[model samples]
Target: EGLFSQKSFLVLGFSNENESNIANIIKENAGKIMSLLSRTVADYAVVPLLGCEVEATVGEVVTNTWLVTCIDYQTLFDPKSNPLFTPVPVMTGMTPLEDCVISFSQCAGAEKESLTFLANLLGASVQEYFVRKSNAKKGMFASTHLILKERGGSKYEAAKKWNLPAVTIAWLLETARTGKRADESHFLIENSTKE
Candidate 1:
Protein backbone atom coordinates (compact mmCIF):
# COMPACT_ATOMS: atom_id res chain seq x y z
CA GLU A 1 0.00 0.00 0.00
CA GLY A 2 2.78 2.38 0.89
CA LEU A 3 4.49 1.61 -2.40
CA PHE A 4 1.34 2.18 -4.43
CA SER A 5 0.60 5.30 -2.43
CA GLN A 6 4.06 6.54 -3.27
CA LYS A 7 3.59 5.65 -6.91
CA SER A 8 0.53 7.89 -7.02
CA PHE A 9 2.84 10.92 -6.98
CA LEU A 10 3.85 12.51 -10.26
CA VAL A 11 7.43 13.62 -10.86
CA LEU A 12 8.37 15.96 -13.70
CA GLY A 13 11.80 17.12 -14.72
CA PHE A 14 12.93 19.85 -17.08
CA SER A 15 15.79 19.43 -19.57
CA ASN A 16 18.28 21.61 -21.49
CA GLU A 17 15.22 22.95 -23.29
CA ASN A 18 14.48 26.23 -21.51
CA GLU A 19 15.80 24.97 -18.17
CA SER A 20 17.82 28.11 -17.49
CA ASN A 21 15.05 30.42 -18.59
CA ILE A 22 12.63 28.48 -16.40
CA ALA A 23 14.98 28.89 -13.45
CA ASN A 24 15.15 32.63 -13.97
CA ILE A 25 11.40 32.76 -14.08
CA ILE A 26 11.17 30.84 -10.88
CA LYS A 27 13.48 33.28 -9.13
CA GLU A 28 11.80 36.33 -10.62
CA ASN A 29 8.31 35.28 -9.58
CA ALA A 30 9.26 33.39 -6.46
CA GLY A 31 5.98 33.78 -4.62
CA LYS A 32 3.90 32.96 -7.67
CA ILE A 33 5.83 29.76 -8.28
CA MET A 34 5.49 28.81 -4.65
CA SER A 35 1.74 29.15 -4.85
CA LEU A 36 1.22 27.04 -7.95
CA LEU A 37 3.56 24.08 -7.92
CA SER A 38 4.13 23.68 -4.22
CA ARG A 39 7.64 24.16 -5.55
CA THR A 40 9.52 26.67 -7.69
CA VAL A 41 9.93 25.71 -11.35
CA ALA A 42 11.70 28.41 -13.30
CA ASP A 43 15.46 28.18 -12.72
CA TYR A 44 15.32 25.44 -10.11
CA ALA A 45 12.56 23.69 -8.22
CA VAL A 46 12.00 25.06 -4.74
CA VAL A 47 9.43 23.31 -2.59
CA PRO A 48 6.75 25.67 -1.25
CA LEU A 49 5.70 23.59 1.72
CA LEU A 50 6.85 25.40 4.86
CA GLY A 51 6.95 23.71 8.26
CA CYS A 52 9.06 22.88 11.34
CA GLU A 53 9.28 19.68 13.40
CA VAL A 54 10.08 20.01 17.10
CA GLU A 55 10.91 17.42 19.78
CA ALA A 56 11.74 17.76 23.47
CA THR A 57 14.99 16.43 24.91
CA VAL A 58 16.58 16.03 28.31
CA GLY A 59 20.20 14.90 28.40
CA GLU A 60 20.23 11.85 26.04
CA VAL A 61 16.60 10.84 26.29
CA VAL A 62 14.08 11.18 23.47
CA THR A 63 10.48 11.81 24.55
CA ASN A 64 7.38 13.00 22.73
CA THR A 65 6.36 16.59 21.99
CA TRP A 66 6.41 17.07 18.25
CA LEU A 67 5.01 19.90 16.11
CA VAL A 68 5.40 21.33 12.64
CA THR A 69 4.20 24.65 11.22
CA CYS A 70 1.52 24.20 8.57
CA ILE A 71 2.33 27.55 6.93
CA ASP A 72 6.04 26.90 6.63
CA TYR A 73 5.50 23.60 4.89
CA GLN A 74 3.09 25.21 2.44
CA THR A 75 5.54 27.99 1.62
CA LEU A 76 8.30 25.48 0.97
CA PHE A 77 6.51 23.38 -1.62
CA ASP A 78 4.93 25.22 -4.52
CA PRO A 79 3.15 22.99 -7.02
CA LYS A 80 4.20 25.51 -9.65
CA SER A 81 7.87 24.63 -9.02
CA ASN A 82 7.66 20.93 -9.93
CA PRO A 83 10.01 19.90 -7.12
CA LEU A 84 12.19 16.83 -6.99
CA PHE A 85 12.90 15.52 -3.52
CA THR A 86 16.45 14.86 -2.42
CA PRO A 87 17.14 13.24 0.90
CA VAL A 88 17.38 16.17 3.27
CA PRO A 89 19.57 14.99 6.17
CA VAL A 90 17.58 14.35 9.35
CA MET A 91 18.00 12.99 12.85
CA THR A 92 15.77 10.02 13.59
CA GLY A 93 16.03 9.24 17.30
CA MET A 94 16.87 10.98 20.59
CA THR A 95 16.21 10.89 24.32
CA PRO A 96 13.23 13.25 24.26
CA LEU A 97 11.62 12.96 20.84
CA GLU A 98 9.05 15.07 19.05
CA ASP A 99 8.65 15.26 15.30
CA CYS A 100 6.27 17.37 13.23
CA VAL A 101 6.39 16.48 9.55
CA ILE A 102 4.41 18.13 6.78
CA SER A 103 3.20 16.31 3.71
CA PHE A 104 5.27 16.77 0.59
CA SER A 105 2.37 17.40 -1.78
CA GLN A 106 -0.07 20.30 -1.90
CA CYS A 107 -2.63 21.39 -4.49
CA ALA A 108 -3.55 24.77 -5.85
CA GLY A 109 -6.77 26.88 -5.45
CA ALA A 110 -9.50 25.11 -3.52
CA GLU A 111 -7.12 22.26 -2.92
CA LYS A 112 -5.24 24.41 -0.45
CA GLU A 113 -8.44 24.94 1.51
CA SER A 114 -9.09 21.22 1.42
CA LEU A 115 -5.68 20.64 2.89
CA THR A 116 -6.54 23.09 5.65
CA PHE A 117 -9.72 21.17 6.40
CA LEU A 118 -7.91 17.87 6.57
CA ALA A 119 -5.23 19.41 8.74
CA ASN A 120 -7.81 20.63 11.21
CA LEU A 121 -9.09 17.08 11.57
CA LEU A 122 -5.64 15.70 12.16
CA GLY A 123 -4.75 18.46 14.59
CA ALA A 124 -7.71 17.56 16.76
CA SER A 125 -6.61 13.96 16.88
CA VAL A 126 -3.07 15.04 17.59
CA GLN A 127 -4.25 17.24 20.44
CA GLU A 128 -6.32 14.46 21.95
CA TYR A 129 -3.51 11.93 21.67
CA PHE A 130 -1.20 14.11 23.72
CA VAL A 131 -3.65 14.91 26.50
CA ARG A 132 -2.16 13.98 29.89
CA LYS A 133 -3.89 11.53 32.15
CA SER A 134 -5.55 13.23 35.09
CA ASN A 135 -5.12 12.23 38.71
CA ALA A 136 -8.06 14.12 40.20
CA LYS A 137 -8.65 13.23 43.79
CA LYS A 138 -12.01 11.43 44.07
CA GLY A 139 -15.52 12.97 44.71
CA MET A 140 -14.97 15.93 47.03
CA PHE A 141 -11.93 17.23 45.16
CA ALA A 142 -13.90 17.02 41.90
CA SER A 143 -12.37 15.96 38.62
CA THR A 144 -11.38 18.81 36.35
CA HIS A 145 -12.26 19.19 32.70
CA LEU A 146 -9.89 17.96 30.06
CA ILE A 147 -9.60 21.48 28.73
CA LEU A 148 -7.23 23.58 30.76
CA LYS A 149 -7.62 27.14 32.02
CA GLU A 150 -5.07 29.75 30.91
CA ARG A 151 -3.55 30.01 34.37
CA GLY A 152 -2.46 26.39 34.22
CA GLY A 153 -5.43 24.18 34.93
CA SER A 154 -5.21 20.49 35.76
CA LYS A 155 -4.00 19.28 32.41
CA TYR A 156 -1.49 22.07 32.02
CA GLU A 157 -0.39 21.68 35.60
CA ALA A 158 -0.03 17.97 35.08
CA ALA A 159 1.96 18.53 31.91
CA LYS A 160 4.29 20.80 33.82
CA LYS A 161 4.62 18.47 36.79
CA TRP A 162 5.31 15.41 34.67
CA ASN A 163 7.54 17.40 32.38
CA LEU A 164 6.07 15.68 29.37
CA PRO A 165 7.34 17.19 26.18
CA ALA A 166 4.70 19.31 24.42
CA VAL A 167 5.03 21.16 21.14
CA THR A 168 3.38 24.29 22.59
CA ILE A 169 5.83 24.44 25.49
CA ALA A 170 8.76 23.82 23.21
CA TRP A 171 7.56 26.58 20.90
CA LEU A 172 7.25 29.06 23.77
CA LEU A 173 10.68 28.30 25.17
CA GLU A 174 12.23 28.39 21.71
CA THR A 175 10.68 31.75 20.93
CA ALA A 176 11.83 33.16 24.26
CA ARG A 177 15.41 31.90 24.11
CA THR A 178 16.14 32.46 20.44
CA GLY A 179 13.67 35.23 19.62
CA LYS A 180 12.74 33.21 16.55
CA ARG A 181 9.68 31.08 15.93
CA ALA A 182 10.25 27.33 15.74
CA ASP A 183 9.18 27.25 12.09
CA GLU A 184 12.10 29.54 11.20
CA SER A 185 14.60 27.55 13.24
CA HIS A 186 15.65 24.39 11.41
CA PHE A 187 18.70 24.22 13.63
CA LEU A 188 16.49 23.22 16.55
CA ILE A 189 15.14 20.24 14.62
CA GLU A 190 18.62 19.25 13.40
CA ASN A 191 20.33 19.18 16.78
CA SER A 192 17.43 17.76 18.76
CA THR A 193 17.14 14.60 16.69
CA LYS A 194 20.57 14.06 15.16
CA GLU A 195 23.48 12.00 16.48
Candidate 2:
Protein backbone atom coordinates (compact mmCIF):
# COMPACT_ATOMS: atom_id res chain seq x y z
CA GLU A 1 0.00 0.00 0.00
CA GLY A 2 2.85 2.32 -0.80
CA LEU A 3 0.80 4.22 -3.33
CA PHE A 4 1.88 7.49 -1.73
CA SER A 5 5.38 6.56 -0.66
CA GLN A 6 6.96 10.00 -0.98
CA LYS A 7 3.78 11.98 -1.54
CA SER A 8 2.55 14.45 1.00
CA PHE A 9 -0.67 16.45 1.30
CA LEU A 10 -2.66 18.77 3.53
CA VAL A 11 -6.19 17.42 3.45
CA LEU A 12 -8.62 20.14 4.61
CA GLY A 13 -12.28 21.19 4.29
CA PHE A 14 -13.57 18.10 6.08
CA SER A 15 -15.07 17.27 9.45
CA ASN A 16 -12.73 16.30 12.28
CA GLU A 17 -13.87 12.67 11.98
CA ASN A 18 -13.34 12.62 8.21
CA GLU A 19 -10.11 14.58 8.50
CA SER A 20 -8.70 12.00 10.90
CA ASN A 21 -9.82 9.20 8.60
CA ILE A 22 -8.21 10.80 5.56
CA ALA A 23 -5.02 11.29 7.55
CA ASN A 24 -5.02 7.66 8.53
CA ILE A 25 -5.63 6.63 4.94
CA ILE A 26 -2.71 8.71 3.81
CA LYS A 27 -0.49 7.27 6.52
CA GLU A 28 -1.62 3.78 5.76
CA ASN A 29 -0.68 4.32 2.15
CA ALA A 30 2.74 5.65 3.13
CA GLY A 31 2.13 9.35 2.64
CA LYS A 32 3.21 12.20 4.84
CA ILE A 33 0.86 14.81 6.26
CA MET A 34 2.22 18.34 6.17
CA SER A 35 1.68 19.79 9.62
CA LEU A 36 3.53 23.10 9.25
CA LEU A 37 2.95 26.08 7.01
CA SER A 38 5.87 27.43 5.00
CA ARG A 39 7.23 27.81 1.45
CA THR A 40 7.03 24.75 -0.77
CA VAL A 41 6.46 22.48 2.18
CA ALA A 42 4.21 19.99 0.45
CA ASP A 43 3.38 18.90 -3.08
CA TYR A 44 -0.22 20.00 -2.88
CA ALA A 45 -2.80 21.44 -0.55
CA VAL A 46 -5.88 19.30 -1.10
CA VAL A 47 -8.73 21.75 -0.65
CA PRO A 48 -12.45 21.87 -1.34
CA LEU A 49 -12.07 24.20 -4.26
CA LEU A 50 -9.21 25.38 -6.39
CA GLY A 51 -7.73 28.67 -5.21
CA CYS A 52 -10.42 28.67 -2.58
CA GLU A 53 -9.96 29.88 0.97
CA VAL A 54 -8.66 27.12 3.20
CA GLU A 55 -7.41 26.86 6.79
CA ALA A 56 -3.87 26.48 5.48
CA THR A 57 -0.41 27.76 4.62
CA VAL A 58 0.57 25.01 2.14
CA GLY A 59 1.77 24.43 -1.43
CA GLU A 60 0.21 24.05 -4.91
CA VAL A 61 -3.51 24.38 -4.30
CA VAL A 62 -5.82 21.59 -5.49
CA THR A 63 -9.19 20.05 -4.73
CA ASN A 64 -10.06 17.11 -2.49
CA THR A 65 -11.74 15.30 -5.40
CA TRP A 66 -8.57 14.05 -7.03
CA LEU A 67 -7.23 12.71 -3.76
CA VAL A 68 -10.20 10.41 -3.27
CA THR A 69 -10.19 9.34 -6.89
CA CYS A 70 -6.51 8.60 -6.57
CA ILE A 71 -7.01 6.61 -3.43
CA ASP A 72 -9.93 4.56 -4.70
CA TYR A 73 -8.39 4.02 -8.11
CA GLN A 74 -5.03 3.26 -6.53
CA THR A 75 -3.47 5.72 -8.87
CA LEU A 76 -1.55 8.72 -7.61
CA PHE A 77 -3.36 11.36 -9.62
CA ASP A 78 -2.20 14.67 -10.93
CA PRO A 79 -3.57 17.65 -9.05
CA LYS A 80 -3.80 19.85 -12.15
CA SER A 81 -5.74 17.17 -14.02
CA ASN A 82 -8.69 17.82 -11.76
CA PRO A 83 -11.82 19.18 -13.44
CA LEU A 84 -11.65 21.99 -10.86
CA PHE A 85 -8.23 22.94 -12.16
CA THR A 86 -9.63 26.29 -13.21
CA PRO A 87 -9.41 28.41 -10.11
CA VAL A 88 -12.51 29.93 -8.59
CA PRO A 89 -12.92 33.45 -7.14
CA VAL A 90 -11.27 33.32 -3.76
CA MET A 91 -13.66 35.20 -1.51
CA THR A 92 -13.13 35.07 2.22
CA GLY A 93 -16.58 33.83 3.18
CA MET A 94 -17.77 32.53 -0.17
CA THR A 95 -18.36 28.83 -0.75
CA PRO A 96 -18.44 26.87 -4.02
CA LEU A 97 -22.14 26.14 -3.70
CA GLU A 98 -23.40 29.25 -1.95
CA ASP A 99 -26.23 29.47 -4.47
CA CYS A 100 -27.78 25.99 -4.67
CA VAL A 101 -29.88 23.88 -2.34
CA ILE A 102 -29.27 20.12 -2.06
CA SER A 103 -32.35 18.24 -0.94
CA PHE A 104 -32.04 14.61 0.13
CA SER A 105 -34.65 11.91 0.53
CA GLN A 106 -35.91 11.13 4.03
CA CYS A 107 -35.26 7.49 3.22
CA ALA A 108 -31.57 7.99 2.52
CA GLY A 109 -29.27 7.19 5.41
CA ALA A 110 -25.77 6.55 3.99
CA GLU A 111 -26.14 9.60 1.81
CA LYS A 112 -25.39 11.58 4.99
CA GLU A 113 -21.78 12.04 3.86
CA SER A 114 -22.94 13.65 0.64
CA LEU A 115 -25.19 15.89 2.71
CA THR A 116 -22.19 16.89 4.75
CA PHE A 117 -20.10 17.49 1.62
CA LEU A 118 -22.82 19.56 -0.01
CA ALA A 119 -23.58 21.58 3.10
CA ASN A 120 -20.14 21.94 4.64
CA LEU A 121 -17.55 21.99 1.87
CA LEU A 122 -19.81 23.16 -0.95
CA GLY A 123 -21.97 25.46 1.19
CA ALA A 124 -25.35 24.34 -0.05
CA SER A 125 -28.35 24.36 2.27
CA VAL A 126 -29.17 20.67 2.80
CA GLN A 127 -32.45 19.07 3.86
CA GLU A 128 -32.12 15.53 5.13
CA TYR A 129 -35.90 15.12 5.51
CA PHE A 130 -37.76 17.70 3.43
CA VAL A 131 -41.07 17.68 1.63
CA ARG A 132 -42.45 20.60 -0.36
CA LYS A 133 -45.90 22.03 0.15
CA SER A 134 -46.91 23.96 -2.95
CA ASN A 135 -49.34 26.09 -0.94
CA ALA A 136 -46.53 27.17 1.39
CA LYS A 137 -44.31 30.21 0.77
CA LYS A 138 -42.08 31.63 -1.94
CA GLY A 139 -38.94 29.64 -1.06
CA MET A 140 -40.75 26.80 0.58
CA PHE A 141 -38.87 24.31 -1.59
CA ALA A 142 -35.24 24.94 -2.22
CA SER A 143 -34.48 21.96 -4.41
CA THR A 144 -31.64 22.38 -6.91
CA HIS A 145 -30.79 18.70 -6.96
CA LEU A 146 -32.55 15.88 -5.17
CA ILE A 147 -30.56 12.94 -3.80
CA LEU A 148 -32.74 9.88 -3.46
CA LYS A 149 -31.75 6.48 -2.12
CA GLU A 150 -34.30 4.86 -4.41
CA ARG A 151 -37.22 5.75 -6.66
CA GLY A 152 -40.91 6.32 -5.73
CA GLY A 153 -41.11 8.65 -2.72
CA SER A 154 -42.42 12.10 -1.76
CA LYS A 155 -39.54 13.66 -3.65
CA TYR A 156 -40.19 11.44 -6.63
CA GLU A 157 -43.77 12.73 -6.75
CA ALA A 158 -42.76 16.30 -5.97
CA ALA A 159 -40.18 16.05 -8.73
CA LYS A 160 -42.97 15.99 -11.32
CA LYS A 161 -44.52 19.27 -10.13
CA TRP A 162 -41.33 21.13 -9.15
CA ASN A 163 -39.23 19.56 -11.92
CA LEU A 164 -36.59 18.76 -9.33
CA PRO A 165 -33.38 17.40 -10.83
CA ALA A 166 -33.08 14.09 -9.04
CA VAL A 167 -29.59 12.73 -8.94
CA THR A 168 -28.31 9.70 -7.08
CA ILE A 169 -25.20 9.02 -4.96
CA ALA A 170 -23.41 8.34 -8.23
CA TRP A 171 -23.55 12.08 -8.82
CA LEU A 172 -21.98 12.72 -5.45
CA LEU A 173 -19.25 10.18 -6.04
CA GLU A 174 -18.55 11.57 -9.50
CA THR A 175 -18.14 15.08 -8.10
CA ALA A 176 -15.83 13.56 -5.51
CA ARG A 177 -13.72 12.17 -8.31
CA THR A 178 -13.68 15.22 -10.53
CA GLY A 179 -13.50 17.83 -7.82
CA LYS A 180 -16.15 19.82 -9.67
CA ARG A 181 -19.85 19.87 -10.40
CA ALA A 182 -20.21 16.63 -12.32
CA ASP A 183 -22.75 17.03 -15.09
CA GLU A 184 -25.92 15.87 -13.32
CA SER A 185 -27.30 14.37 -16.50
CA HIS A 186 -24.78 11.54 -16.34
CA PHE A 187 -26.06 10.25 -13.00
CA LEU A 188 -29.76 11.00 -13.13
CA ILE A 189 -32.08 8.80 -11.07
CA GLU A 190 -33.99 7.84 -14.21
CA ASN A 191 -30.79 6.16 -15.35
CA SER A 192 -30.82 4.28 -12.08
CA THR A 193 -34.45 3.24 -12.58
CA LYS A 194 -34.47 2.49 -16.29
CA GLU A 195 -31.21 1.05 -17.66
Candidate 3:
Protein backbone atom coordinates (compact mmCIF):
# COMPACT_ATOMS: atom_id res chain seq x y z
CA GLU A 1 0.00 0.00 0.00
CA GLY A 2 1.32 3.42 -0.99
CA LEU A 3 1.11 6.54 1.22
CA PHE A 4 -1.50 7.74 -1.21
CA SER A 5 -2.94 4.30 -1.61
CA GLN A 6 -6.00 4.45 -3.87
CA LYS A 7 -5.77 8.27 -3.77
CA SER A 8 -5.20 10.36 -6.91
CA PHE A 9 -3.02 13.45 -6.73
CA LEU A 10 -3.25 16.34 -9.17
CA VAL A 11 0.07 18.03 -8.57
CA LEU A 12 0.42 21.12 -10.73
CA GLY A 13 2.84 23.81 -11.94
CA PHE A 14 5.92 21.74 -12.60
CA SER A 15 7.00 21.94 -16.21
CA ASN A 16 9.68 23.60 -18.35
CA GLU A 17 7.48 23.95 -21.40
CA ASN A 18 6.52 27.54 -20.69
CA GLU A 19 8.71 30.54 -20.07
CA SER A 20 7.79 31.78 -16.61
CA ASN A 21 9.88 32.68 -13.60
CA ILE A 22 8.53 29.74 -11.64
CA ALA A 23 8.55 27.29 -14.51
CA ASN A 24 12.29 26.68 -14.11
CA ILE A 25 11.93 25.85 -10.45
CA ILE A 26 9.00 23.58 -11.10
CA LYS A 27 10.70 21.76 -13.94
CA GLU A 28 13.79 21.07 -11.85
CA ASN A 29 12.10 19.64 -8.76
CA ALA A 30 8.73 18.42 -9.97
CA GLY A 31 10.27 15.11 -10.99
CA LYS A 32 11.44 14.54 -7.44
CA ILE A 33 7.97 15.08 -6.06
CA MET A 34 6.37 12.96 -8.76
CA SER A 35 8.81 10.14 -8.19
CA LEU A 36 8.34 10.25 -4.42
CA LEU A 37 4.57 10.40 -4.65
CA SER A 38 4.30 7.65 -7.24
CA ARG A 39 6.58 5.29 -5.33
CA THR A 40 5.19 6.00 -1.87
CA VAL A 41 1.51 6.74 -2.29
CA ALA A 42 -0.45 8.09 -5.25
CA ASP A 43 -2.19 5.53 -7.39
CA TYR A 44 -2.75 7.74 -10.43
CA ALA A 45 -0.71 10.83 -11.33
CA VAL A 46 -1.42 13.72 -13.66
CA VAL A 47 1.45 15.78 -14.96
CA PRO A 48 0.78 19.49 -14.49
CA LEU A 49 -0.05 21.52 -17.54
CA LEU A 50 2.41 24.01 -18.84
CA GLY A 51 2.15 27.44 -17.21
CA CYS A 52 -0.18 25.95 -14.62
CA GLU A 53 -0.28 28.19 -11.61
CA VAL A 54 1.69 26.45 -8.86
CA GLU A 55 1.08 29.20 -6.34
CA ALA A 56 -2.57 29.96 -6.47
CA THR A 57 -3.89 32.93 -4.54
CA VAL A 58 -6.68 30.86 -2.96
CA GLY A 59 -6.32 27.24 -3.97
CA GLU A 60 -7.51 26.96 -7.51
CA VAL A 61 -8.27 23.56 -8.96
CA VAL A 62 -6.21 22.80 -12.06
CA THR A 63 -7.34 19.28 -12.73
CA ASN A 64 -10.62 17.43 -13.29
CA THR A 65 -9.43 14.03 -12.15
CA TRP A 66 -11.98 12.24 -10.02
CA LEU A 67 -12.18 12.47 -6.28
CA VAL A 68 -8.63 13.72 -5.98
CA THR A 69 -6.72 14.76 -2.89
CA CYS A 70 -5.55 18.36 -3.07
CA ILE A 71 -2.07 19.55 -2.17
CA ASP A 72 -1.37 23.23 -2.55
CA TYR A 73 1.55 24.49 -4.59
CA GLN A 74 2.97 26.14 -1.50
CA THR A 75 2.63 22.98 0.55
CA LEU A 76 4.59 21.11 -2.06
CA PHE A 77 6.96 23.98 -2.91
CA ASP A 78 7.49 26.04 0.22
CA PRO A 79 10.36 28.40 -0.52
CA LYS A 80 11.70 28.21 3.02
CA SER A 81 11.61 24.57 4.08
CA ASN A 82 10.16 21.99 1.75
CA PRO A 83 12.06 18.76 1.25
CA LEU A 84 10.81 18.16 -2.29
CA PHE A 85 11.05 21.69 -3.62
CA THR A 86 13.98 24.06 -3.44
CA PRO A 87 13.89 27.54 -4.96
CA VAL A 88 16.09 28.16 -7.99
CA PRO A 89 19.04 30.26 -6.90
CA VAL A 90 19.20 33.11 -9.42
CA MET A 91 21.21 36.29 -9.83
CA THR A 92 18.94 39.31 -9.78
CA GLY A 93 19.32 42.92 -10.94
CA MET A 94 21.11 41.72 -14.01
CA THR A 95 20.78 42.92 -17.57
CA PRO A 96 19.87 40.52 -20.36
CA LEU A 97 22.32 39.48 -23.04
CA GLU A 98 21.24 39.05 -26.63
CA ASP A 99 19.40 35.78 -27.24
CA CYS A 100 21.92 33.02 -27.93
CA VAL A 101 21.95 29.34 -28.75
CA ILE A 102 24.05 27.17 -26.46
CA SER A 103 24.78 23.46 -26.15
CA PHE A 104 26.89 21.38 -23.81
CA SER A 105 29.14 18.47 -24.66
CA GLN A 106 28.46 15.55 -22.33
CA CYS A 107 32.13 15.71 -21.42
CA ALA A 108 31.58 19.20 -20.10
CA GLY A 109 32.67 19.02 -16.47
CA ALA A 110 29.33 20.08 -15.00
CA GLU A 111 25.99 18.66 -14.11
CA LYS A 112 23.01 19.11 -16.42
CA GLU A 113 21.42 21.43 -13.89
CA SER A 114 24.52 23.60 -13.75
CA LEU A 115 24.55 23.92 -17.53
CA THR A 116 20.83 24.68 -17.52
CA PHE A 117 21.33 27.23 -14.77
CA LEU A 118 23.93 29.03 -16.82
CA ALA A 119 21.83 28.92 -19.99
CA ASN A 120 18.69 30.08 -18.16
CA LEU A 121 20.65 32.70 -16.27
CA LEU A 122 21.93 34.06 -19.55
CA GLY A 123 18.51 33.76 -21.23
CA ALA A 124 19.75 31.55 -24.05
CA SER A 125 18.15 28.72 -25.96
CA VAL A 126 19.42 25.19 -25.15
CA GLN A 127 19.91 23.03 -28.21
CA GLU A 128 19.10 19.43 -27.51
CA TYR A 129 21.44 16.71 -28.69
CA PHE A 130 20.60 14.54 -31.67
CA VAL A 131 18.82 11.30 -30.87
CA ARG A 132 21.53 9.23 -32.51
CA LYS A 133 24.70 11.25 -31.97
CA SER A 134 24.29 12.56 -28.43
CA ASN A 135 25.65 15.78 -29.86
CA ALA A 136 23.75 18.58 -31.48
CA LYS A 137 23.13 17.79 -35.12
CA LYS A 138 25.14 19.67 -37.71
CA GLY A 139 22.20 21.86 -38.60
CA MET A 140 20.98 22.27 -35.03
CA PHE A 141 24.33 22.97 -33.43
CA ALA A 142 24.60 26.18 -31.46
CA SER A 143 27.11 28.89 -32.24
CA THR A 144 28.29 29.08 -28.65
CA HIS A 145 29.47 25.74 -27.31
CA LEU A 146 30.92 24.59 -23.99
CA ILE A 147 33.21 21.61 -23.55
CA LEU A 148 35.97 20.28 -21.30
CA LYS A 149 39.57 21.11 -22.14
CA GLU A 150 40.38 17.46 -22.85
CA ARG A 151 37.27 15.87 -24.35
CA GLY A 152 37.09 13.58 -27.36
CA GLY A 153 33.96 11.94 -28.68
CA SER A 154 31.28 12.47 -31.26
CA LYS A 155 30.53 15.86 -29.74
CA TYR A 156 34.17 16.86 -29.78
CA GLU A 157 34.55 15.81 -33.40
CA ALA A 158 31.33 17.53 -34.36
CA ALA A 159 32.46 20.76 -32.72
CA LYS A 160 35.71 20.57 -34.62
CA LYS A 161 34.02 19.95 -37.96
CA TRP A 162 31.59 22.78 -37.41
CA ASN A 163 34.41 25.06 -36.30
CA LEU A 164 32.52 25.80 -33.11
CA PRO A 165 34.23 27.95 -30.53
CA ALA A 166 34.50 25.79 -27.42
CA VAL A 167 34.65 27.63 -24.14
CA THR A 168 35.54 26.40 -20.65
CA ILE A 169 33.04 25.71 -17.88
CA ALA A 170 34.74 28.34 -15.71
CA TRP A 171 33.60 30.92 -18.26
CA LEU A 172 29.99 29.84 -17.98
CA LEU A 173 30.05 29.71 -14.18
CA GLU A 174 31.73 33.10 -13.90
CA THR A 175 29.34 34.68 -16.36
CA ALA A 176 26.44 33.17 -14.44
CA ARG A 177 27.81 34.14 -11.03
CA THR A 178 28.55 37.66 -12.14
CA GLY A 179 26.35 39.78 -14.38
CA LYS A 180 29.10 40.39 -16.93
CA ARG A 181 29.86 37.90 -19.69
CA ALA A 182 33.34 36.45 -19.70
CA ASP A 183 35.61 37.21 -22.63
CA GLU A 184 35.78 34.46 -25.26
CA SER A 185 39.57 34.73 -25.49
CA HIS A 186 40.11 33.70 -21.88
CA PHE A 187 37.96 30.57 -22.01
CA LEU A 188 38.53 29.23 -25.52
CA ILE A 189 39.61 25.58 -25.43
CA GLU A 190 43.21 24.97 -26.44
CA ASN A 191 43.56 22.12 -28.91
CA SER A 192 47.10 21.29 -27.86
CA THR A 193 46.45 21.19 -24.12
CA LYS A 194 44.94 17.86 -23.06
CA GLU A 195 45.07 17.03 -19.39
In the order shown, the candidates' Cα RMSDs to the true structure are: 16.8, 8.4, 12.1
Between prediction 1 and prediction 2, the one with superior lDDT is 2
Q: Which candidate is the best by lDDT?
A: 2
Local distance difference test scores for all models: 0.27, 0.63, 0.45
- lDDT, candidate 2, at 164: 68
- TM-score for each model: 0.20, 0.44, 0.43
Best by TM-score: 2
Query: Tens digit of lDDT per residue, candidate 2, span 1-195?
Result: 599898787876667887788788878989888864744577667665434456655557765555666676788766666444323332335355556567777433212543454445656766554555422454454567787667777777787667768888666545544456668788778778754
Sort by TM-score, best first: 2, 3, 1
- Those runs of model 1 whose alpha carbons end farther than 4 Å from true positions after fitting are 1-31, 34-89, 92-131, 134-154, 158-195
Model 3 Cα lDDT, one tens digit per residue, 75-187? 33222231112223335655343455666665322245446655765776666662223343465644456544455666667666777667766666566557677676777
How accurate locally is residue 102 in candidate 3, as Cα lDDT from 0 to 100? Answer: 66
Candidate 2 residue 89 C-alpha distance from true site, Å: 22
Q: Which of the predicted structures, 1 or 3, would earn the higher TM-score when compared with the native?
A: 3
Write the residue-wise lDDT of candidate 1 on 1-195 in tens digits.
111121111112334454344434333433222222333222222221221231221111110000012123433332323211221222222211123222211133433333333233222111222233433452122121112113334444554455542232233223333433344233222124433
Task: Return the lDDT, model 1, position 105.
Answer: 19
Clashes of each: 43, 0, 3
